[PDB]
Amino acid sequence: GSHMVPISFVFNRFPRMVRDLAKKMNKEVNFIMRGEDTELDRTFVEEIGEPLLHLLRNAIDHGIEPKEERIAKGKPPIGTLILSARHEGNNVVIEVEDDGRGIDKEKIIRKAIEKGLIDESKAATLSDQEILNFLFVPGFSTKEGVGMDVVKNVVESLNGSISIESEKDKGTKVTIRLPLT
């Protein structure tokens, strides 16, 4: 790689943003960053900021439940949000994981049925990955050009890839793979 620079050039700006977001949304969250010394193409560093911030915001908004709710639910009172970078072969892997309520998969199914994309019989045969992928279909999720869409497009314009996994009341993990320059 030619113009390598530590991912910290983009990471160090998140602790402040996370705390303020958590305060505004009345959420209690412990933010952990890992692999801040991971080197990657400077172009990626300058472009991956917007996408990551959105995933972080998603986690704080839709993921982590208010402290009172986590308590009522029987989970540790403070939520955990982890942002990490690491090497996997010739790929830099960035992950945003929260231990929140998890993506509501039924909600997605209901929305897909409403849009006429699938019917009830078919909906019952879909796999979790199949359900979660609806989140990447442009125009699927209602807006207010932000969203999972913009995240995937930006990541893919860097020749990157993005995947999602989630478990009810367990949390959600978004994974971004960036290529070695």
Ligand X SMILES: Nc1ncnc2c1ncn2[C@@H]1O[C@H](COP(=O)(O)OP(=O)(O)CP(=O)(O)O)[C@@H](O)[C@H]1O
Binding site for its own copies (CB under 8 A): 3, 30, 32-34, 36-37, 42-43, 46-47, 71, 74-80, 82, 84, 138-139, 145, 153-154, 156-159
**Of the candidate residues 31, 41, 45, 58, the single one contacting ligand X (CB under 6 A):** 58
Rounded CA-CA distance 161/143 in Å is 23
103 counts as binding ligand X under rule CB under 6 A: yes
- Quote the tokens at residue 70: 């986590």
143 counts as binding ligand X under rule CB under 6 A: yes
Alpha helix locations (H) across 39-138? 42-47, 49-58, 67-73, 105-114, 120-123, 128-132
- Quote the tokens at residue 129: 């990955």
**Of the candidate residues 51, 63, 79, 160, the single one contacting ligand X (CB under 6 A):** 63
Rounded CA-CA distance 155/147 in Å is 13
Output 115 or 122, the one with its CB closest to its own copies: 115
State in Å, rounded, how far the first CA of the chain is from the last one. 5
Smallest gap, in angstroms, from Cβ of residue 23 to its own copies?
17
Smallest gap, in angstroms, from Cβ of residue 98 to ligand X?
5
Output 131 or 173, the one with its CB closest to its own copies: 173
Stated length of the chain: 181
